[PDB]
Design an enzyme around this catalytic site. Structure first.
Site, mmCIF file in Angstrom:
data_model
loop_
_atom_site.group_PDB
_atom_site.id
_atom_site.type_symbol
_atom_site.label_atom_id
_atom_site.label_comp_id
_atom_site.label_asym_id
_atom_site.label_seq_id
_atom_site.Cartn_x
_atom_site.Cartn_y
_atom_site.Cartn_z
ATOM 1 N N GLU A 95 -9.888 6.043 2.695
ATOM 2 C CA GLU A 95 -10.691 4.873 3.201
ATOM 3 C C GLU A 95 -9.971 3.792 3.507
ATOM 4 O O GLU A 95 -9.106 3.814 2.933
ATOM 5 C CB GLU A 95 -11.911 4.574 1.961
ATOM 6 C CG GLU A 95 -11.452 3.508 1.016
ATOM 7 C CD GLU A 95 -10.392 3.864 0.250
ATOM 8 O OE1 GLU A 95 -10.204 4.932 0.000
ATOM 9 O OE2 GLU A 95 -9.698 2.994 -0.259
ATOM 10 N N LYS B 149 0.853 -1.256 -0.026
ATOM 11 C CA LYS B 149 -0.044 0.070 -0.031
ATOM 12 C C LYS B 149 0.830 1.350 0.061
ATOM 13 O O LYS B 149 0.396 2.241 -0.578
ATOM 14 C CB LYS B 149 -0.785 -0.236 1.163
ATOM 15 C CG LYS B 149 -1.928 -1.058 1.123
ATOM 16 C CD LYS B 149 -2.799 -0.896 0.086
ATOM 17 C CE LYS B 149 -3.834 -2.044 -0.079
ATOM 18 N NZ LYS B 149 -4.660 -1.861 -1.030
ATOM 19 N N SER C 33 2.315 -9.474 -0.637
ATOM 20 C CA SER C 33 1.580 -8.131 -0.513
ATOM 21 C C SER C 33 2.055 -7.576 0.670
ATOM 22 O O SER C 33 2.125 -6.256 0.909
ATOM 23 C CB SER C 33 0.275 -7.933 -1.176
ATOM 24 O OG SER C 33 -0.593 -8.903 -0.176
#
Ligand SMILES: Cc1ncc(COP(=O)(O)O)c(CN[C@@H](CO)C(=O)O)c1O
Ligand SMILES: Cc1ncc(COP(=O)(O)O)c(CN[C@@H](CO)C(=O)O)c1O
Ligand code: NA
Ligand code: NA
Lengths: 252, 394, 394, 252
Positions: free
Chosen positions: C108, C86, C376
């Site tokens: 969000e 991210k 990830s």
């Protein structure tokens, strides 16, 4: 003094092996400990190996670890240990008394001062558990200057150089933990006492038969203390019984 | 006898029961051989790069230093696999274990960071791993405990003594004393008997080597000082090593001041202890007037080792390195400052080092200085701790 | 009109209230300009390298594949600052916000990972950050919540609707609708109205670019397939992008199968949903026969986005990428396997991708295949979750 | 049909502005909603804007969000909404009825089918909240084929191109959220109705005075519903009162 020399001379004249019990000073209390020690002597202990409670006994197993816990629970300090030592010697003039110490307690306020204190109370030897021969010079020197015998452990695998060093550096007795015994005698080492696992009369007779001058019961005595904490009287009775048996096994 | 000097001045040595000397000598020999073996170095470099993530970043902190003449960089060991610098040397020690034909690993841990690092290295390299951890620590470190088990390691609680790190340290040695033939003791800091202080430094020295290359690249000169927290001394000596011969570079080690040195509740034995002999070495110890070993206190679980590496005591004695202390409150403030101004959550251990750099900056805002703080670990693990405190203080 | 195609085949678009179109057009323009600005690229590359820690490692997993003809590499986004991929695109979007003269950030988050990433990027770049998070999520994500606040971000719980991610998504848009003049909406996945699917892919494409360079370096050829979990689609499109034109490289996206597709409790809208229009885009949605939007279920909090990026729906339709699903139990088993055999604790999201690679390997052990799984994120955050389950199942 | 055209023609002949209240179909229940709607009509509403509860009304504020919550709590579905629409039209043949929809509910089972259904029940217009003019082609086309007026929101900042598109694409009325009004008339846009913030009689008179054909009360009606949930009777009484006042303000 020459208490170890005098002791081994006498045991030899009687074709006898020495039996040496170990106990932690102040375990379970100062008063009971003094009684425990007098009982070991009355029952036939030829010499004593006494431990001074230390916070981190990294060279000891569970039994001794708990002995220290008990001693500390009783508030036992090295200072009190030295007071007990003076009382012990004052009651028994000839039995050899050896201390089993951790380096920090010897080094703490001066190595020389520690051995000077040992000499003052009448201690005969000191085995510093965590000082290998390689790091022993200051300890050995201070010991000798104060007529204290520095004792060394001769490990199972002790190679030749180690055997030679231990033979040259140690006095009083060699803490042995056939060939090993022969080499030690060959290098004129202090009489060897077999330690570790010595917990039955037959082991005492086996050690002497192998050539050792005797045996040290490193923890069997402490176990008995631990088992009879509930009844001090039974504790001493059982201690007397065990030592009597162990010592008898050393006789010819 | 040994191949390498077991002492740093008066500090260090090999104060272990005779039975353990062969293990130390064996280890020293393998280490000397490994260090001259290009194949060992290449395998260690490969794991560090492709598995652990080296080189780690050197992050400039402009938001923090704005308005002052301090330039601050953070060596990002918090980005190393595992979340702390511990990973570096456990990989090197695990490779050493294999070089010696050992198949098992024994480790001690306090905060659990080293335990987790030993477990991950063992998992990666096929070593059976068992970890000793003081019962009080296992209790307050269940997350790290579970990590260690997920990775296949056996976690063994130590209830003897104070049931903390020093106690786990004794138990590790006891174990190794009878198993070194097949097991290697993976000590977690730059302390203990030789060759450990030496091996740990050498297996952590890439921290400083990278920092030097990175600082030269970005600033064209060496730092005015490198700052690192000191629990046992591994991340700090790892950062310091390559700079020792650069006399212009200050080396500042930061010990935990806990509630304050004057309260007696601290973990700063190097500057506020007394030399003793314990854990196989002669070094400044947290100890009673009587010589009994005591615990180090700090809001950070990781600065709990009650002594300090002998090399730090030595660098301090000759004046090459300077050691200071930082309190729980100062470390907490640096922790908050870094989160808010740089978006990096630092370990509370590392926060002590950052707190001292913040003091160097704030006390003399117009002093021109290039500083590097070794961010030894990330502080995700400390979020609960900080939360409660901040909440408790309203 | 737009500068770039808002659609991938039939999927995508800009289905937002008219009032929000200027914000999207403004953003698209700035993005196109930024992409052609060497200075923007250099600033983004600098943050990625010196702050976030790129390039991330590519770790070979020999312990896992031993005895088979599968060679497996893990792209280590778990080592990126923040613990997940991210971070890459929030830094790029934060820089875009600044390029547009914006001083505030709206974001969000479901699992809180993106919220934490938005907060850290905002802290670093001096942006005032506010995060919308569904009340049910804030509840089960208090650790991430606190992190966000330590970093100075305002966390706003959303109780409307199901109080989850889709609800936080609506609230973000609502807010931006009236504040885009000074605030940028930092969307967390490769979905939503154009230009977001495009921007997120481009700001995550270094994952695949690095993977390609790393695999060529280590194996001298491209992977037979790259595998990534798919929640919204950002880490997967980040890994896939650079390989799309390499027709020999399989692109496998893994959606959460939850308790099993047949139970209806899953999060696999791409292969088991129905195309709808929501969140500003036309794409496969988790929805009732009536057209009401439903939630995605998965043991992993991060694969909760009830739709999927339009580009994935498009790559699936033309057969360029293949999408599969992995159940909660399969993901848990891969999680355990990676911890035990490689000493890496993977995020439960990433564990779905690893689980599928493990299936490709195990089902055909003698099939020669070079695979790369995009890891990830790290799973330290999932330790509690896994613990309870394993304990619950005795 | 031409209900909006017929309505505005009549309002013009009376130099009157239109007043259009919005309510969510099925809020708080189907039965009460039908009563609420009949009351709005009896009180003077010139047309109706009716919302169909949607799970994720990303274009609505808190008031409407809660209206949907209430409708869903009552089990309201789009199918029931269409049944209510048929009943509403069957009771009121000429009032224009416009729906405020989210794209997914229109697209769900076919855009054409949705507008065909609107035409069948007698709906006059549809405003798809999340379909900007740029994405409106299929919606606009389907609407026109089924005699449904596609309604578009003309935002505050609407630049010229948008004004032109909205003027060209919309029918029935332009949902306005001076220059704006002049340009819309200039491009022959559907009559503009002022929305957003319309919650007092004076705002209705101000809108008509500015050039708008009327006003839409986007949420004031829903608030009244929300405040009187406790007493359905008082709810309708207050609804009647408010609408009466709002409508009166539109008269010349
Ligand atoms: C992030 C971080 N930074 C600093 C230290 C302190 O040790 P060091 O001085 O050896 O670097 C630790 C130690 N941690 C030890 C003792 O608790 C462990 O067993 O994990 C750490 O985990
Ligand atoms: C480690 C990791 N891996 C995968 C995903 C899935 O999203 P992606 O498909 O966009 O890559 C997430 C998402 N996380 C989202 C939704 O909960 C967030 O707000 O944080 C993640 O945190
Ligand atoms: Na210390
Ligand atoms: Na999804």
């Amino acid at each position: 003094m020459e208490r170890y020399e005098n002791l081994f001379a006498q045991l030899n004249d009687r074709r006898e092996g020495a039996f040496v019990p170990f106990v932690t000073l102040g375990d379970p209390g100062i008063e009971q400990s003094l009684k425990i020690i007098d009982t070991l002597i009355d029952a036939g202990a030829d010499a004593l190996e006494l431990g001074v409670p230390f916070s981190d006994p990294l060279a000891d197993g569970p039994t001794i670890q708990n002995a220290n816990l008990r001693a500390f629970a009783a508030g036992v300090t090295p200072a009190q240990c030295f007071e007990m030592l003076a009382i012990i010697r004052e009651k028994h003039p000839t039995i050899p008394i050896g201390l089993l110490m951790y380096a920090n307690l010897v080094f703490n306020n001066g190595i020389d001062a520690f051995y000077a204190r040992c000499e003052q109370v009448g201690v005969d030897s000191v085995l510093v558990a965590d000082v290998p021969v390689e790091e022993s010079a200051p300890f050995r020197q201070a010991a000798l200057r104060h007529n204290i015998a520095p004792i060394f452990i001769c490990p199972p695998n002790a190679d030749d150089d180690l055997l030679r060093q231990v033979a040259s550096y140690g006095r009083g007795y060699t803490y042995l933990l056939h060939h090993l015994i022969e080499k030690l005698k060959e290098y004129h080492a202090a009489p060897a006492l077999q330690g570790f696992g010595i917990s039955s009369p037959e082991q005492v007779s086996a050690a002497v038969r192998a050539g050792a001058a005797g045996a040290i019961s490193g923890s069997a005595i402490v176990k008995i203390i631990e088992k009879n904490l509930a009844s001090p009287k039974q504790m001493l009775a059982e201690l007397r019984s065990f030592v009597s048996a162990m010592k008898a096994a050393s006789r010819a | 006898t040994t191949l390498l000097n077991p002492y740093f001045g008066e500090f260090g040595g090999m104060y272990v029961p005779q039975i353990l000397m062969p293990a130390l000598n064996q280890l020293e020999e393998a280490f000397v051989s490994a260090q001259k073996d290009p194949e060992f170095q290449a395998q260690f470099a490969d794991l560090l790069k492709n598995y652990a993530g080296r080189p780690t970043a050197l992050t400039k902190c402009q938001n923090i230093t704005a308005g002052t003449r301090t330039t601050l960089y953070l060596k990002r060991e918090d980005l190393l696999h595992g979340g702390a610098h511990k990973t570096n040397q456990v990989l090197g020690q695990a490779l050493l274990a294999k070089r010696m034909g050992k198949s098992e690993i024994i480790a001690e841990t306090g905060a659990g960071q080293h335990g987790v690092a030993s477990a991950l290295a063992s998992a990666l390299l096929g070593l059976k791993c068992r970890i000793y951890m003081g019962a009080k620590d296992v209790e307050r470190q269940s997350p790290n405990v579970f990590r260690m088990r997920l990775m296949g390691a056996e976690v063994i609680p130590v209830h003897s003594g104070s049931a903390t790190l020093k106690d786990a340290c004794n138990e590790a040695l006891r174990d190794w004393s009878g198993s070194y033939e097949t097991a290697h003791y993976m000590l977690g800091t730059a302390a203990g008997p030789h060759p450990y202080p030496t091996i740990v430094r050498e297996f952590q020295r890439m921290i400083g080597e990278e920092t030097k290359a990175q600082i030269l690249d970005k600033e064209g000169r060496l730092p005015d000082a490198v700052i690192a927290c000191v629990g046992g001394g591994s991340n700090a000596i790892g950062m310091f090593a390559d700079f020792i011969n650069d006399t212009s570079v200050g080396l500042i080690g930061v010990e935990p001041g806990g509630h304050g040195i004057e309260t007696g509740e601290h973990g700063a034995p190097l500057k506020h202890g007394r030399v003793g002999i314990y854990f196989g070495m002669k070094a400044p110890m947290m100890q009673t007037a009587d010589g009994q070993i005591e615990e180090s206190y700090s809001i950070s679980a990781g600065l709990d080792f009650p002594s300090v590496g002998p090399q730090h005591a030595y660098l301090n004695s000759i004046g090459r390195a300077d050691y200071v202390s930082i309190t729980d409150d100062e470390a907490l403030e640096a922790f908050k400052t870094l989160c808010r101004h740089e978006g990096i959550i630092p370990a509370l251990e590392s926060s002590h080092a950052l707190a001292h750099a913040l003091k160097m900056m704030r006390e003399q805002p117009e002093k021109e200085q290039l500083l590097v703080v070794n961010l030894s670990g990330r502080g995700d693990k400390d979020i609960f701790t900080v939360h409660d405190i901040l909440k408790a203080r309203g």
